């Protein structure tokens, strides 16, 4: 992937040198911010189910036309698959929080996002809506530093989808 540590190592490797002071200071800043990030990861880990469902019904509520038969929303397997997708994004946001880098998102969701979205006629707007719900919910769930730390990856994913 590409964390802070991993990006520092890549920069000091391609350039074929050692790690100087600035790269070590970047690593130090990462080590500092790790603990708020791990706290946020714990918090979002505990409330996985509530976030996933609340986002699911939020998305169905924003575009009510999706639900009725003859389109994507209808079908029990389809809604279970909606839940699976929203859980996927939530898990990868937690992963980015743990690693303190946008690596896992770029690796697992963003790389290939547009082509898979267009191939299956999926819509980003649904996922921006769900990510907005998770944004709002984590707004009250979290507070302080871990708050903005999680919000940053949430709206990074929203920017990627938008």
């Amino acid at each position: 992937s590409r964390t802070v540590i991993t990006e520092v190592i890549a920069t000091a490797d391609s350039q074929g040198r050692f790690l100087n002071s600035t790269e070590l200071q970047a690593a130090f800043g990462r080590f500092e911010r790790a603990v708020p990030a791990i706290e946020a990861a714990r918090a979002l880990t505990k409330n996985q189910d509530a976030l996933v469902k609340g986002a699911v019904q939020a998305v169905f509520k924003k575009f009510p036309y999706v639900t009725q038969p003859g389109e994507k929303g209808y079908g029990d397997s389809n809604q279970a698959k909606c839940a699976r997708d929203i859980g996927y994004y939530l898990r990868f946001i937690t992963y980015s929080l743990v690693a303190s880098g946008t690596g896992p998102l770029d690796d697992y969701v963003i790389a290939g996002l547009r082509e898979v979205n267009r191939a299956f006629n999926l819509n980003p707007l649904w996922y921006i809506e769900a990510l907005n719900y998770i944004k709002g919910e984590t707004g009250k769930l979290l507070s302080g530093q871990s708050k903005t730390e999680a919000l940053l990856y949430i709206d990074h994913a929203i920017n990627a989808l938008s």
Partner: protein, 172 residues
């Protein structure tokens, strides 16, 4: 190219689950004692010329046939290759130390280096002994407690020792 965090995320994706609480706890511990690791990596970085010089001195002392005519480090070009190779090995040792992962070492450097040295007729035992001399000098320079607060680093010492052992074992 992975650190311990990316390894844990890799296992989590292999299972398909969130990171379990034991994993998160040990990762938080890793991050908390990571300021040990940063200082140890800095010690390696700022001492590396000394380790290289000392490994060269003792290595060519034990095996002077490497500097005898026709020995496989005789001209200045193969001396430069020897020193550059030990320097590179130490670089990826320090990269593994900071990352807490032996993936960068093994993949980026140690995947074909045995076959590289075999294809050129290089005695891999000399390279392995050079790596061991580097680990000994690195430990000598890691005991340095100047300009720093004193504490325990036996975890870091074991990590550096096992990284150097990984190098000297994958070579031959």
């Amino acid at each position: 190219m992975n650190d311990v965090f990316t390894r844990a995320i890799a296992q989590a994706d292999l299972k398909g689950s969130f990171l379990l609480e034991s994993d998160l706890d040990k990762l938080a511990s890793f991050a908390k004692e990571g300021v040990k690791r940063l200082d140890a990596v800095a010690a390696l970085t700022n001492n590396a010329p000394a380790i290289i010089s000392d490994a060269a001195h003792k290595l060519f002392a034990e095996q002077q046939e490497l500097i005898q005519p026709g020995g496989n480090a005789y001209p200045h070009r193969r001396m430069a290759a020897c020193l550059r190779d030990m320097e590179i090995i130490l670089r990826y040792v320090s990269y593994a130390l900071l990352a807490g992962d032996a993936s960068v070492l093994d993949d980026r450097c140690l995947n074909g280096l045995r076959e590289t040295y075999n294809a050129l007729g290089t005695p891999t035992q000399s390279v392995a002994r050079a790596v061991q001399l580097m680990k000994d000098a690195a430990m000598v320079h890691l005991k340095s407690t100047a300009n720093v607060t004193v504490g325990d680093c036996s975890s870091l010492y074991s990590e550096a020792a096992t990284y150097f052992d990984k190098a000297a074992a994958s070579i031959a």
